[PDB]
Design a protein around this ligand. Structure first.
Ligand SMILES: CC(=O)N[C@H]1[C@H](OCCc2ccc3occc3c2)O[C@H](CO)[C@@H](O)[C@@H]1O
Length: 512
């Protein structure tokens, strides 16, 4: 694909990927690059940095305020009042001012902008966070946190109960709890009333309370999370903690009857002798249609249609893609069409894995389901490719250096035979070092380096009252934390479907 042919395709991650491939091979001229940002679907990350090596962006200063950016710290007392207040939006700018000018500006703004006054006078002290905390200036607190994560102080009951109302609270709490940073802030958040938090925030504050062995407070946070979470899977995670902490058999019963298939509902079913959930069986009689499963642009087009289809148009697409060749697209349509109530666990292109042992089959299928939903031309925002979502660098390492496949190109990752073969190859490497399918999943998504560093820690996946569940909540990268739980659920299901059942309690025992 030349740039001229790509420019005729609709904007998509597939088009972005192929533009990025031209940039990385130096095939986009300064002239070609002129109109190109209107041809880019998601102008973020590597494609933006490559394009900008060809054409810098000067942009962008609102023309109304351009004059404001002609002043510096040395000349800002010469600027009009609007210019002064625009430049004081930046804490680095405030930090750069001399203290006499901070005093002058704080007086200027005391009436109309006491927020600015508070920050100016804060930066005249040796600890601006202490000054902002004494004022109980909530917007000021978050500005200072965004400026520097190194500030740490005890916060009283009144102040900590005010923080949840700010949009920044959820990321603040998640970051400091998961990274085990800012211990005075962490300890302070034990005094947050569960009435003042909900959803993710409540849940994280439950995890926080567990780490300080405040189990009654933890229960109260998790109960609030369960009552407020929008997604049944998250509610189930919260109910599981309620159960682990207080052992009310009604909580375990509710969890065992969940409509969501996740590790918590599966565990609860096992503990209560409840039958394994019903898994749909898709067996289209029609063998093919016209659709090209190897065309990445055709997938981008049909995906967009499927995601914008009303209740009625989903039924039309379901029928058209109800074939063996388009089974992954069929299951994808059904999963949306049935409002995520039915469990679809397909095994496409099965001839490529049927000679592996069943435990290995299940792990491959579990990874593919979460990575791609088995869509052969799946492309991620980071341009991971195909059913097993290989990053180009690893794909080329395996395909060119290790396997020495003649005329190998990274786009071979769109072929199911190649995806499953490479997937098996990398999963062999990972499993030989890590053993547990949960740890393998963490390493598949996050890398073996991150996984090894986590497992080297004294506080992760060791013995303990709430282990290994607590450790699973504290995996320090959110994408990997979530991924491991999903892949582990899938693994249990596929082992069951292949007549190679394992108890999820055995998996959990082997994590410690
Ligand atoms: C295609 C894609 O973006 N896949 C994602 C995947 O996205 C969720 C599943 C998925 C599958 C097929 C899809 O086709 C269009 C969007 C999409 C998302 O998330 C994983 C992390 O949990 C990533 O490792 C993986 O690269």
């Amino acid at each position: 694909y030349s740039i001229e042919k790509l420019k005729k395709e609709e904007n998509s991650l597939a088009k972005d990927y192929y533009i990025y491939r031209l940039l990385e091979k130096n095939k986009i001229s300064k002239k070609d690059a002129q109109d190109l940002n209107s041809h880019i679907f998601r102008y973020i990350g590597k494609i933006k940095s490559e394009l900008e090596k060809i054409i810098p962006l000067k942009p962008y200063i609102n023309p109304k305020y351009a004059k404001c950016y002609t002043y510096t710290a040395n000349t800002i007392l010469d600027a009009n009042l609007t210019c002064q207040s625009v430049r004081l939006n930046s804490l680095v700018f405030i930090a750069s001012l001399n203290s006499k000018d901070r005093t002058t500006l704080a007086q200027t703004f005391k009436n109309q902008r006491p927020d600015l006054t508070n920050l100016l006078l804060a930066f005249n002290t040796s600890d601006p966070m202490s000054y902002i905390v004494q004022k109980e200036d909530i917007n000021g607190f978050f500005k200072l946190y965004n400026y520097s994560k190194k500030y740490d102080l005890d916060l009283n009951t009144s102040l900590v109960n005010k923080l949840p109302n700010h949009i920044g609270f959820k990321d603040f709490a998640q970051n400091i709890i998961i990274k085990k940073e800012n211990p005075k802030f962490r300890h302070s958040m034990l005094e947050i009333n569960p009435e003042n938090v909900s959803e993710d925030s409540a849940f994280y504050l439950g995890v926080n309370a567990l780490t300080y062995d405040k189990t009654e407070l933890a229960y109260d946070f998790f109960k609030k999370a369960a009552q407020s979470f929008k997604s049944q899977s998250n509610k189930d995670n919260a109910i599981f903690w309620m159960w682990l902490i207080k052992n009310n058999e009604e909580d375990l019963k509710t969890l065992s009857q969940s409509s969501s298939l996740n590790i918590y509902s599966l565990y609860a079913k096992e503990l209560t002798n409840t039958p394994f959930p019903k898994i749909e069986s898709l067996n289209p009689s029609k063998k093919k249609n016209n659709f090209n499963m190897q065309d990445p642009f055709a997938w981008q087009k049909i995906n967009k249609q499927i995601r914008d289809a009303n209740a009625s148009q989903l039924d039309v697409l379901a029928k058209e893609f109800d074939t063996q060749e388009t089974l992954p697209i069929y299951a994808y349509i059904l999963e949306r069409k049935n409002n995520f109530k039915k469990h679809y666990f397909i095994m496409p292109y099965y001839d490529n894995i049927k000679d592996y042992n069943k435990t290995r089959q299940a792990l491959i299928l579990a990874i593919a389901r979460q990575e791609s939903r088995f869509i052969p031309t799946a492309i991620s925002v980071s341009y991971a490719l195909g059913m097993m979502q290989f990053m180009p660098f690893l794909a080329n390492h395996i395909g060119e250096k290790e396997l020495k496949i003649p005329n190998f190109d990274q786009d071979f990752m769109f072929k199911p035979e190649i995806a499953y073969y490479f997937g098996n190859y990398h999963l062999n490497y990972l499993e030989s070092r890590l053993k547990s399918p949960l740890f393998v999943a963490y390493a598949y998504n996050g890398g073996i380096g991150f996984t090894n560093r986590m497992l080297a820690r004294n506080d992760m996946f060791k013995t303990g009252k709430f282990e290994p569940f607590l450790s699973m909540e504290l995996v320090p990268y959110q994408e990997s934390r979530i991924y491991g739980k999903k892949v582990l659920a899938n693994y249990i299901v596929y082992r069951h479907l292949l007549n190679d059942s394992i108890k999820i309690s055995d998996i959990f025992e082997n994590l410690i």
